Design a protein around this ligand. Structure first.
Ligand SMILES: *[C@@H]1O[C@H](CO)[C@@H](O[C@@H]2O[C@H](CO)[C@@H](O)[C@H](O)[C@H]2NC(C)=O)[C@H](O)[C@H]1NC(C)=O
Ligand SMILES: *[C@@H]1O[C@H](CO)[C@@H](O[C@@H]2O[C@H](CO)[C@@H](O)[C@H](O)[C@H]2NC(C)=O)[C@H](O)[C@H]1NC(C)=O
Ligand SMILES: *[C@@H]1O[C@H](CO)[C@@H](O[C@@H]2O[C@H](CO)[C@@H](O)[C@H](O)[C@H]2NC(C)=O)[C@H](O)[C@H]1NC(C)=O
Ligand SMILES: *[C@@H]1O[C@H](CO)[C@@H](O[C@@H]2O[C@H](CO)[C@@H](O)[C@H](O)[C@H]2NC(C)=O)[C@H](O)[C@H]1NC(C)=O
Ligand SMILES: *[C@@H]1O[C@H](CO)[C@@H](O[C@@H]2O[C@H](CO)[C@@H](O)[C@H](O)[C@H]2NC(C)=O)[C@H](O)[C@H]1NC(C)=O
Ligand SMILES: *[C@@H]1O[C@H](CO)[C@@H](O)[C@H](O)[C@H]1NC(C)=O
Ligand SMILES: *[C@@H]1O[C@H](CO)[C@@H](O)[C@H](O)[C@H]1NC(C)=O
Ligand SMILES: *[C@@H]1O[C@H](CO)[C@@H](O)[C@H](O)[C@H]1NC(C)=O
Ligand SMILES: *[C@@H]1O[C@H](CO)[C@@H](O)[C@H](O)[C@H]1NC(C)=O
Ligand SMILES: *[C@@H]1O[C@H](CO)[C@@H](O)[C@H](O)[C@H]1NC(C)=O
Ligand SMILES: *[C@@H]1O[C@H](CO)[C@@H](O)[C@H](O)[C@H]1NC(C)=O
Ligand SMILES: *[C@@H]1O[C@H](CO)[C@@H](O)[C@H](O)[C@H]1NC(C)=O
Lengths: 413, 165, 204
């Protein structure tokens, strides 16, 4: 019987609060399909290859061939649109500044490498290395992998030099340290935490990037590739079935029976192959609908995860999301979500209010924690105890009403 | 069969003769008159796509033979296929009529041209560890977002459709 | 402008027209008119042709219905997205970037349209930018001061604190900045003075 994970019990009590004293910056890799192979099948050639009589007999069935050619073409155009929506969300192709003094954060692994024949970043190279004629053709994607790489590099350069501003209007340069200060303000951790520990955060981030590189050094994308390849191979193999005809090979039937006799055999084969083609087209339509849902999710993540900051839990990595970086990959997109996860918690005794002269004080932002002898107010996601003062607390009501109010003194500046 | 017959670099074993492919098609036939292990390749086939600007603007057009070598067919070679009637221009622009493999066509000065799409203008950001751009003014913009919601509530009387009374 | 809705209507019309036109195909029968088959051939013979026609027409109907089901699934996804936008964009304000129109979303107004909904998203977009010098914090009396809201800027001679999304400089005061640590930790701190509103009141 499966374990369902380890067991745990939280030391909950009506006056005990755990506050994190340390933090980790974790980079998680989230891989999403975006597009699939642009297949195209000529129903006439697949069904009645080079056989005039077979083509004439097929003509009777009417518009089946035409609407199959319409559905597959629609899938192809939709795939091109998926790529366009997911990636082409930056109006202007930005480029990173020549001097990469990003407050000590080292992005060289994610930015493009000019020395490569194709301007792809190292991670993109690892991802590319990771993923691996009868009436059927493959139409090349509208944007070659190089243009996808250009788009991802532009998004990344904007995210690095301008934060989310380039998402709203014109990209407004802003030092990366201050951008992370803004993001820490976003997750609720006061900005001074960032500056007072910039070097540690930089080292943690660089170690995270290295760990991601090692981990990559792609199940979902290979799944799409394998499924489409499998559908194509099945469709090709169906040509060998007799469907009740004397022989699968149409030419043999042509030189085996008189036209009136061969008509029945060719009709049997045409029904069989047409049914197989309809099945393949329906399967492709459904799988392409799934891929469109996936690509729409990828576009939504690009918009609300890269170009901005997410307050949505577990939508953008596991943790207090800080930012994201896109990367291309064959028929898909890989996000490196940078997140702030607290750690090294400590137990403290808590209290909802503090009474000084009969007035009940409540914290403006943060909570009251005692190390056993003294009371302090600290931000909820970090341990920064501070003296309790009228500036840090706002008055309301009186002592009687509140439940759990404890006695202390509020220093007056 | 109908194909390009070409002597096979792959050689049938002395017993091997008249091989087939995974698709069950006849991959190669050993030469009957004099064993030569002749291989068969399907003759070139593709799709013809008419790249045309709106007839109201002009009646001039170009043709794209998809996935065929230009020789087999002012011809320009593209990964998508051979493009006939279109002029190749080094200058890049915004993609107007997408062709494929990064190549797009358009009608400009007047004739049909093919080119590599730019993807947008280049704009380097003046980043530096002590420079910030803070807006001093704003604009209130109204944008339109159109979404389908419902489709015609069709229904079919299968018995009457199939059988005409 | 109405490409999305016009495409839906055209697709439905095309589906119906193809379905109706399928009735005229022979499907291997001697004729596509049932009464002609009944009249011309004997019942035992006519049964085979009518069976072939029924097979063809049933296959055509099944193809039409499958196309309708898939397209209706796509429209249902679109309707779920539209309802989500109506809920999070009209009946409120959204922090989701590019979910409710480029820029910082302010509000929305819905409008009906044939088989669809058209939103007018009103959004706030910064327009004009000026280069300023900035520093993370300011040390006044040996204690670092960081902005409570917004960022520090310098016009080249003096330092001010301004809200992030709009230039409106103000004098740096103990009411705009809070103290944490000392000057020896922050990277890039700059020297300046922080005005004290309380000092002049007690001085006089
Ligand atoms: C917060 O945690 C980080 C790592 O999780 C600590 O940094 C490590 O500190 C130890 C010293 O005990 C060093 O040996 C390691 O090399 C440090 N690692 C890194 C990546 O810098 C940090 O000291 C912790 N801070 C507090 C206040 O506990
Ligand atoms: C960013 O990281 C890369 C690699 O993770 C660093 O490049 C390495 O630089 C050292 C010398 O400083 C060389 O010995 C290595 O061979 C380099 N590795 C690679 C893969 O190029 C780069 O120096 C780092 N930059 C910063 C500013 O930290
Ligand atoms: C709880 O915190 C207070 C605040 O610092 C501690 O009191 C200080 O203790 C240090 C020694 O640890 C003395 O040098 C200071 O003079 C004390 N100041 C005050 C105002 O008391 C107290 O010791 C801490 N108690 C526990 C159990 O951690
Ligand atoms: C907190 O302090 C207040 C007074 O500062 C305490 O209120 C006292 O409660 C007792 C018990 O009913 C009364 O006899 C006293 O007259 C009250 N004091 C005053 C000034 O009226 C309160 O009990 C204290 N609470 C705790 C938890 O210590
Ligand atoms: C900002 O001002 C402080 C003092 O107000 C400067 O600190 C001085 O640094 C020099 C160089 O090490 C020392 O010789 C002085 O003793 C320091 N002053 C004091 C009062 O200790 C600091 O250098 C100034 N920084 C800038 C960028 O102007
Ligand atoms: C808080 O107390 C509980 C009591 O069971 C203990 O298990 C837990 O480890 C304590 N918290 C920390 C951070 O040590
Ligand atoms: C917490 O609960 C304990 C009993 O478990 C009780 O004695 C105590 O008064 C309670 N304190 C508060 C603040 O609710
Ligand atoms: C097309 O044929 C020419 C010569 O006939 C050859 O040089 C070229 O490589 C071929 N290209 C492709 C894509 O087959
Ligand atoms: C584009 O420029 C290259 C030189 O870099 C030249 O060889 C080529 O002929 C140009 N394109 C056209 C269509 O002339
Ligand atoms: C801000 O822009 C508007 C037009 O966009 C203009 O009318 C107004 O004068 C501008 N304000 C300033 C202070 O320049
Ligand atoms: C800020 O300075 C850079 C220096 O290259 C310049 O390109 C930019 O235009 C300046 N800011 C604005 C708003 O023009
Ligand atoms: C910014 O970088 C320059 C070098 O480009 C350096 O001289 C300067 O001290 C740095 N200032 C800060 C605040 O990091």
């Amino acid at each position: 019987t499966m374990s369902l994970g380890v067991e745990n019990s939280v030391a909950y009590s009506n006056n005990s609060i755990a506050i994190p004293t340390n933090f980790t910056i974790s980079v998680t890799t989230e891989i999403l399909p975006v597009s699939m192979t642009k297949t195209s099948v000529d129903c006439t050639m697949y069904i009645c290859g080079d056989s005039t009589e077979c083509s004439n007999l097929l003509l009777q069935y009417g518009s089946f061939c035409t609407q199959l050619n319409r559905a597959l073409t629609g899938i192809a155009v939709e795939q091109d649109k998926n790529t366009q929506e997911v990636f082409a969300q930056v109006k202007q192709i930005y480029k990173t500044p020549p001097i990469k003094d990003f407050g000590g954060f080292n992005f060289s692994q994610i930015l493009p490498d000019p020395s490569k024949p194709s301007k792809r970043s190292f991670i993109e190279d690892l991802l590319f290395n990771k993923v691996t004629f009868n009436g059927l053709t493959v139409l090349p994607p509208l944007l070659t992998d190089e243009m996808i790489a250009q788009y991802t590099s532009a998004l990344l350069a904007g995210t690095i030099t301008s934060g989310w501003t380039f998402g709203a209007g014109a990209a407004l340069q802003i030092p990366f340290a201050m951008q992370m200060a803004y993001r820490f303000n976003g997750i609720g951790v006061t900005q001074n935490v960032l500056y007072e520990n910039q070097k540690l955060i930089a080292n943690q981030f660089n170690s995270a990037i290295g760990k991601i590189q090692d981990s990559l050094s792609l199940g979902k994308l290979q799944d799409v590739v394998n499924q489409n390849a499998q559908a194509l191979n099945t469709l090709v193999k169906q040509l060998s079935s007799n469907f009740g005809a004397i022989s699968s090979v149409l030419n043999d039937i042509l030189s085996r029976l008189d036209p009136p006799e061969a008509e029945v055999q060719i009709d049997r084969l045409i029904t069989g192959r047409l049914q197989s083609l309809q099945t393949y087209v329906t399967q492709q339509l459904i799988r392409a609908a799934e891929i469109r849902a996936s690509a729409n999710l990828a576009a939504t993540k690009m918009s609300e995860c890269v170009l901005g900051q997410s307050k949505r839990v577990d939508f953008c990595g596991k943790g207090y999301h800080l930012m994201s970086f896109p990367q291309s990959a064959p028929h898909g997109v890989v996000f490196l979500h940078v997140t702030y996860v607290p750690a090294q918690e400590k137990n403290f005794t808590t209290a909802p209010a503090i009474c000084h002269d009969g007035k009940a004080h409540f914290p403006r932002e943060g909570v009251f924690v005692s190390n056993g002898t003294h009371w302090f107010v600290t931000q909820r996601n970090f341990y920064e105890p501070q003296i309790i003062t009228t500036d840090n607390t706002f008055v309301s009501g009186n002592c009687d009403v509140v439940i759990g109010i404890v006695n202390n003194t509020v220093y007056d500046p | 069969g109908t194909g390009v017959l070409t002597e096979s670099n792959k050689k049938f074993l002395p017993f091997q003769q008249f091989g087939r492919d995974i698709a069950d098609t006849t991959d190669a036939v050993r030469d009957p008159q004099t064993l030569e292990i002749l291989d068969i390749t399907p003759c070139s086939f593709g799709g013809v796509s008419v790249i045309t600007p709106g007839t109201n603007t002009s009646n001039q057009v170009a043709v794209l033979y998809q996935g065929v070598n230009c020789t087999e067919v002012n011809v320009f070679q593209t990964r998508a296929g051979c493009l006939i009637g279109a002029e190749h221009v080094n200058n890049s622009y915004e993609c107007d009529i997408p062709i494929g493999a990064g190549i797009c066509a358009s009608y400009q000065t007047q004739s049909i041209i093919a080119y590599t799409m730019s993807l947008g203008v280049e704009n380097s950001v003046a980043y530096s560890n002590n420079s910030i751009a803070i807006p001093t003014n704003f604009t209130i913009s109204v944008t339109t977002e159109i979404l389908p919601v419902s489709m015609t509530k069709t229904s079919v009387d299968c018995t009457m459709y199939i059988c005409g009374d | 402008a109405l490409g999305k809705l016009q495409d839906v209507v055209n697709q439905n019309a095309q589906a119906l027209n193809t379905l109706v036109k399928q009735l005229s195909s022979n499907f291997g029968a001697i004729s596509s008119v049932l009464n002609d088959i009944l009249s011309r051939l004997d019942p035992p013979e006519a049964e085979v042709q009518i069976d072939r026609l029924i097979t063809g027409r049933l296959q055509s109907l099944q193809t039409y219905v499958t196309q309708q089901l898939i397209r209706a699934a796509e429209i249902r996804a679109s309707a779920n997205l539209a309802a989500t936008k109506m809920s999070e964009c009209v009946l409120g304000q959204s922090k989701r970037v590019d979910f409710c129109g480029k820029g910082y979303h302010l509000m929305s107004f819905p409008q009906s349209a044939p088989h669809g909904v058209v939103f007018l998203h009103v959004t706030y977009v910064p327009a004009q930018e000026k280069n300023f010098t900035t520093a993370p914090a300011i040390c006044h009396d040996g204690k670092a001061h960081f902005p409570r809201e917004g960022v520090f800027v310098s016009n080249g001679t003096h330092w001010f604190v301004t809200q992030r999304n709009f230039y409106e400089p103000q004098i740096i005061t103990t009411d705009n900045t809070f103290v944490s640590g000392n000057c020896d930790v922050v990277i890039g701190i700059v020297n300046n003075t922080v005005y004290d509103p309380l000092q002049p009141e007690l001085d006089s």
